[PDB]
């Protein structure tokens, strides 16, 4: 055999353990696998877990650690359809309220993401030095469509991603006077409006609220980009079109 | 068995199709209708080139090969050994991409995330269909299309493009080819941005989304951003793949000629054309 | 309709960020040039700072004496008439010494000493640009993986311009610099070897760069389809997963079966895309080298 054979043959052998390394560094979330009721699954399928590696926050905020000891750290209100695995969980209660589904959040740190130099990584803009509209039309002041095509509130500010110069949510004002942030990604900018397809109008109240009115917890932000997300599947009675 | 996080995920509701009849998981796999599709066509098609693999005589993978019809046949159906089995096997193969694809949307309504991943597939299913179908019915004969075979799929390829002289040539191949240079250099970059930071020097701190802006902006004196270059990624994968279904639409029927020599447009326009020096003077 | 987050709705701008600072050399850094609204529908609208240190100087020039020598040739072609040089652009060409005079640099001007010369500023503009790459990093604290990287694409370029030339004895073996001439030559060499889509390592770097594609294509997707939890920023995605990971990892096992992690799924990439060249650089130096005909080697060895 020549070498050409030899770099071939070599390369496979190479290529099957960069799949396995690759396969098994992928495990770090997620693993061991469970049965529907929280107990570890009997087959783990054929990848072992790899060995842990810790990644050390900055900070001061500590570190972490996988793959680790995992669990959901919250209730989650769902409940068996059927006597065997492999089947849908109805949900026990309001979907929304309860944070499953669509709707479903991860409990995050209760904190701020913070920028490379330790300050909030997101700001209201008002609270944003020197931050502005630079192009595309500007949305504050401008009132909330729900898809009921009904007005939910309007527009107080724009909240900012300061390191990357990006608007992350839309802070809306609704009827009480009480204010709410809306996923940027989740809203639609119109000439005379702003158009929310995911919510209708009454389930505005609903979404969850944050502590601090000038900073907004990664936490806070999963629960409420989860509720909006998960008004796609649940507020489908009350969307028109 | 489930992710240790998935239970709170897979809930009823989300299906194009069939209400909750369908949804459901076979371990791992959402089933849902189109699940159910997909498994169909995917495996009559797979009975079929199994088929095919005895008209043939062999069992080899690196030797089974479906042939379309021949030329003479045109866009009329062919006995199953003739390349009947191969019409019957594309339009197998189109009905399990399309019930994937909608699967994969039927999967997302019920995550509550946005269609952006079956809308890519798309055009991958849309790239196989230019030369299967859409090529070799502007074309008039199905057997202009590729045969279904490891190797010989190759000789295809080899085959059509050099009856086109050297199809470096054709323009939208070009463009195509920059595309696919170009969203590989991005991936190898992107992943190795990400990995940098999260895998700092050996003790340090994990780095953050401004290190990588600072890097790259000290690099090459920009920057993209995390949304930007996942827009990027996208873009620059879609836009070969639309390339290359373009560069496959106008070959054989708008332009039938040596590629090569479509290039004389620019070189005989009249303002430079008669001037001597240079190559074409 | 449902916004998709390709294009942003709305600007917004702050003051110019100067970056992170750290062990970085802050005197190598420019001011910050202006800010494209254009480029803000798509990435970021700031364009700089830049680091230019002396390594830095070394490759910016280097790269433009190469550019700038291609070009003087270019322009000789032409008989330095404009209308020429336009209508002709990618049909000119600086090609390598012819192979009598194999490996020696006594080959003359017009005979190819030009790209002899032209490969030499090419050569040192890469390489310093690559440890340029390493350094920025190391300055960062940051981890080597784009120089690294880098070095899988630079395999390619060195063997197709140095390494195979130097092992089959001449410089003739070398790539042209031009656009249609060096296009020839790729399909010349495909057939003086036998039709390299037999060559096993072709094959593979093709399965890549196609694989490439087809994983930016769904990491990219997958990304904005969970941008409404937040999914961009992976970082803190990684230290601390989110709703957006979680959606993101099941959607794909709800598919096929299995899954990645959002610093995983980042492994897949890298590699994925450094798989392509690295092939690729072994295909095309066993060609002509040890392998003569890749249809051939493939009559026995397949
Ligand atoms: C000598 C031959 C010619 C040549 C002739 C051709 C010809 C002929 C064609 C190309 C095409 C292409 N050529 Mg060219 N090409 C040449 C030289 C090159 C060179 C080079 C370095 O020289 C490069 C980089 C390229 C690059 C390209 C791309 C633009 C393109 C292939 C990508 C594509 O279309 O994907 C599209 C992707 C698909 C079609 C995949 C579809 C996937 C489907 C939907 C899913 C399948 C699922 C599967 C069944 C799953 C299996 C089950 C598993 C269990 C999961 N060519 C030489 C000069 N080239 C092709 C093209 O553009 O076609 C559109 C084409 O037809
Ligand atoms: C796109 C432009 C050309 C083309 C040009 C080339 C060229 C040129 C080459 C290939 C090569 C490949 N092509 Mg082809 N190929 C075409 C269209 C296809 C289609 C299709 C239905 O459209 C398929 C399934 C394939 C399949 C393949 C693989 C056998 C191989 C690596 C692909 C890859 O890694 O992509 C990236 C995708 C992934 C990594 C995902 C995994 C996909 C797996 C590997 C697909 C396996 C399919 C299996 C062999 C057969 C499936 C049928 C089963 C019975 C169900 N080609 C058209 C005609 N293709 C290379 C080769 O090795 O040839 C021997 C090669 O050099
Ligand atoms: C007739 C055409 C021949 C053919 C001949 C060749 C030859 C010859 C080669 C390839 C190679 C490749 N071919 Mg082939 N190829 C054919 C058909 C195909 C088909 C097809 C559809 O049929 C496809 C998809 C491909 C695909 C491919 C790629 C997988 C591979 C290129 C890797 C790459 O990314 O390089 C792009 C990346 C680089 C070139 C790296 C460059 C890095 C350097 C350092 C960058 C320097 C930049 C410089 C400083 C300028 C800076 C400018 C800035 C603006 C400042 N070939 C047929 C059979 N193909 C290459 C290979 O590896 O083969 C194994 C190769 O050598
Ligand atoms: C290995 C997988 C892929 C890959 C990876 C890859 N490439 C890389 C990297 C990585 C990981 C880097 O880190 C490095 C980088 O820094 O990129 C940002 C790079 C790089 N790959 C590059 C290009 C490149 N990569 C390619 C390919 C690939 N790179 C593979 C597909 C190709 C192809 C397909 O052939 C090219 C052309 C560069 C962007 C960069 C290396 C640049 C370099 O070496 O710099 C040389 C220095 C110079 C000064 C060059 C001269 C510049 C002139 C041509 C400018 C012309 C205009 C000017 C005269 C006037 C302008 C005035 C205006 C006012 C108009
Ligand atoms: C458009 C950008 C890139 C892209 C994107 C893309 N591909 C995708 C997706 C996306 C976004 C998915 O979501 C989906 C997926 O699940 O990814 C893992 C997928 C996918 N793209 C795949 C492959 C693939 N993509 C390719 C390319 C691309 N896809 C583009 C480069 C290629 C290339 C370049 O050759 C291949 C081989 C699969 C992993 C998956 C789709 C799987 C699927 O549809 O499953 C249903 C069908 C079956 C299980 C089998 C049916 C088979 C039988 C009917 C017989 C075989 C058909 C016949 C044509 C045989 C051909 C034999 C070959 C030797 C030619
Ligand atoms: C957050 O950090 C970041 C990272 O991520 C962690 C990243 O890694 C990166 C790094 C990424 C890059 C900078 C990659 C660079 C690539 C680009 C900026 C894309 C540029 C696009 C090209 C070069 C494509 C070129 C293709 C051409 C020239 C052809 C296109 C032509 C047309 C579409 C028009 C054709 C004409 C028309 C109208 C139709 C007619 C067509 C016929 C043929 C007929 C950055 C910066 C980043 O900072
Ligand atoms: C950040 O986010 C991200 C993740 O998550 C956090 C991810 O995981 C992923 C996903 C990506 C990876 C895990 C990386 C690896 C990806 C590749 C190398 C691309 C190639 C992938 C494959 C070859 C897998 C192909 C397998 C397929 C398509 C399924 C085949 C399965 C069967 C054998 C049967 C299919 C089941 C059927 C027929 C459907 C109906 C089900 C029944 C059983 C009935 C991405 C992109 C991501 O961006
Ligand atoms: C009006 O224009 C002006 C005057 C401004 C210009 O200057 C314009 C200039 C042009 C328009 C130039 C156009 C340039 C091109 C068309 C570029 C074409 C280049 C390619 C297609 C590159 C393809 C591949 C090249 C490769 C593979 C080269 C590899 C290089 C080697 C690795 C280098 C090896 C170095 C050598 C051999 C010397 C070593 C000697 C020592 C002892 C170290
Ligand atoms: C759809 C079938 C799945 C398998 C497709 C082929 C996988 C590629 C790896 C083949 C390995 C070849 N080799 C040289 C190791 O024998
Ligand atoms: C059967 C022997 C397999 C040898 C191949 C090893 C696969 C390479 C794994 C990649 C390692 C990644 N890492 C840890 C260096 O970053
Ligand atoms: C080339 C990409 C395809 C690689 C094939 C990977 C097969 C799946 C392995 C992961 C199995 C996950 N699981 C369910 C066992 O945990
Ligand atoms: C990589 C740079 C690409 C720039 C793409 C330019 C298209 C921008 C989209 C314009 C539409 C913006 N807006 C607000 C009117 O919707
Ligand atoms: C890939 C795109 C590269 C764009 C490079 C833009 C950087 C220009 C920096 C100019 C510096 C401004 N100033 C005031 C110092 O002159
Ligand atoms: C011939 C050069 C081949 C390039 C080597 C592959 C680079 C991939 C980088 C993966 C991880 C890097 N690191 C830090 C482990 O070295
Ligand atoms: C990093 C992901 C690994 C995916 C590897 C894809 C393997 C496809 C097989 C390519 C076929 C090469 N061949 C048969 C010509 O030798
Ligand atoms: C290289 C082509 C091979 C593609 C086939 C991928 C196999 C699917 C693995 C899904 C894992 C299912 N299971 C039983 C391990 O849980
Ligand atoms: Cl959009
Ligand atoms: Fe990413």
Same mark, same amino acid.
């Given at each position: ?109 209760? $904190? ?17 030095? &020197? ?102 599947? =649940? ?7 | ?61 690196? $030797? ?18 003739? &390349? ?66 490891? +190797? ?9 493009? =050099? ?119 | ?12 701008? &702050? ?57 003087? +040739? ?55 640009? +690559? ?120 959607? +794909? ?50």
């Amino acid at each position: 055999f020549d070498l050409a054979s030899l770099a071939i043959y070599s390369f496979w052998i190479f290529l099957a353990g960069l799949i396995y390394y690759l396969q098994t560094e992928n495990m770090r979330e997620g693993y061991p696998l469970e049965n529907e009721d929280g107990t570890p699954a009997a087959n783990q399928g054929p990848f072992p877990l790899p060995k842990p590696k810790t990644f050390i926050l900055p900070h001061g905020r500590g570190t972490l650690t996988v793959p680790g000891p995992e669990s959901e750290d919250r209730p989650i209100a769902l409940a068996r359809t059927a006597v065997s695995e492999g089947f849908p969980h109805a949900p026990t209660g309001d979907p929304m309220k309860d944070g499953v589904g669509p709707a479903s959040w991860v409990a995050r740190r209760d $904190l701020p993401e913070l920028d490379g130099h330790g300050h909030n990584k997101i700001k209201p803009m008002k609270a944003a030095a &020197g931050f502005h509209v630079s192009a595309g039309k500007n949305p504050i002041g401008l009132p909330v469509r729900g898809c009921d095509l009904e007005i939910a509130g309007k527009v107080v500010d724009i909240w900012v991603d300061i390191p990357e110069q990006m608007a992350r949510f839309l802070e809306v004002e609704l009827k009480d006077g009480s204010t709410r942030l809306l996923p940027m990604q989740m809203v639609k900018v119109q000439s005379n409006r702003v158009h929310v397809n995911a919510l209708s109008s009454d389930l505005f109240a609903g979404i969850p609220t944050i502590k601090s009115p000038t900073e907004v917890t990664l936490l806070e932000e999963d629960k409420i980009c989860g509720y909006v997300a998960g008004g796609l599947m =649940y507020a489908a009675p009350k969307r028109k079109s | 068995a489930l992710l240790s996080f998935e239970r709170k995920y897979r809930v009823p509701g989300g299906t194009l199709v069939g209400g909750n009849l369908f949804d459901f998981w076979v371990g791992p796999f959402y089933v849902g209708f189109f699940g159910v599709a997909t498994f169909f066509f995917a495996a009559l098609g797979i009975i079929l080139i199994a088929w095919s693999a005895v008209l043939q005589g062999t069992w080899n993978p690196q $030797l089974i090969s479906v042939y379309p019809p021949a030329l003479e046949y045109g866009l009329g159906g062919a006995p199953l050994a003739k &390349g009947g089995l191969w019409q019957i096997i594309t339009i197998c193969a189109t009905g399990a991409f399309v019930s994937w694809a909608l699967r994969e949307v039927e999967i997302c309504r019920k995550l509550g995330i946005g269609y952006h991943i079956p809308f890519a597939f798309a055009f991958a299913i849309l790239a196989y269909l230019t030369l299967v179908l859409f090529r070799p019915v502007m074309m008039g004969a199905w057997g202009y299309a590729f045969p279904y075979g490891i +190797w010989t799929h190759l000789d295809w390829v080899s085959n059509t493009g =050099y009856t086109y002289g050297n199809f470096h040539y054709n323009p939208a191949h070009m463009i195509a080819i920059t595309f696919f240079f170009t969203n590989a250099l991005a991936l190898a970059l992107h992943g190795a941005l990400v990995l940098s930071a999260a895998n700092p020097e050996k003790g340090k701190e994990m780095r953050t989304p401004d290190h990588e802006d600072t890097f790259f902006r000290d690099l090459v004196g920009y920057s993209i951003g995390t949304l930007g270059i996942h827009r990027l990624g996208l873009l620059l994968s879609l836009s070969a793949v639309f390339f290359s279904a373009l560069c496959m639409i106008i070959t054989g029927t708008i332009w039938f000629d040596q590629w090569v020599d479509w290039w004389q447009w620019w070189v005989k326009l009249p303002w430079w054309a008669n001037i001597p020096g240079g190559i074409n003077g | 309709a449902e916004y998709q987050n390709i294009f942003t709705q709305v600007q917004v701008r &702050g003051p110019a960020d100067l970056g992170m600072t750290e062990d970085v050399n802050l005197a190598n850094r420019s001011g910050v040039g202006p800010f494209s609204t254009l480029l803000g529908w798509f990435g970021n609208a700031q364009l700089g700072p830049i680091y230019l240190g002396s390594l830095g100087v070394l490759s910016l020039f280097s790269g433009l004496m190469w550019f700038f020598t291609i070009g003087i +040739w270019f322009w000789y072609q032409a008989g330095w008439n404009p209308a020429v040089f336009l209508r002709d652009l990618f049909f000119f060409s600086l090609e390598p010494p012819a192979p009598e005079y194999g490996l020696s640099f006594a080959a003359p001007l017009k005979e190819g000493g030009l790209w002899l010369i032209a490969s030499f500023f090419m050569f040192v503009a890469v390489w310093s640009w +690559w440890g340029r790459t390493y350094l920025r990093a190391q300055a960062l604290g940051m981890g080597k993986h784009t120089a690294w990287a880098f070095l899988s694409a630079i395999w390619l370029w060195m063997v197709l311009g140095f390494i195979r030339p130097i092992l089959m004895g001449s410089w003739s073996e070398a790539v042209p610099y031009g656009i249609f001439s060096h296009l020839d030559w790729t399909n010349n060499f495909s057939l003086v070897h036998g039709n390299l889509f037999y060559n096993p390592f072709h094959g593979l770097s093709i399965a890549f760069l196609y694989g490439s594609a087809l994983l930016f294509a769904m990491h990219g997707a997958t990304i904005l389809a969970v941008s409404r939890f937040g999914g961009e920023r992976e970082l803190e995605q990684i230290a601390d997963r989110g709703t957006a990971a979680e959606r993101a990892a099941l959607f +794909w096992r709800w598919t096929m079966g299995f899954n990645a992690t959002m610093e995983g799924i980042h492994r897949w990439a890298i590699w994925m895309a450094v798989l392509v060249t690295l092939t690729g650089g072994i295909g095309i130096l066993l060609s002509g080298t040890v392998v003569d005909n890749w249809y051939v080697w493939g009559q026995n060895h397949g």
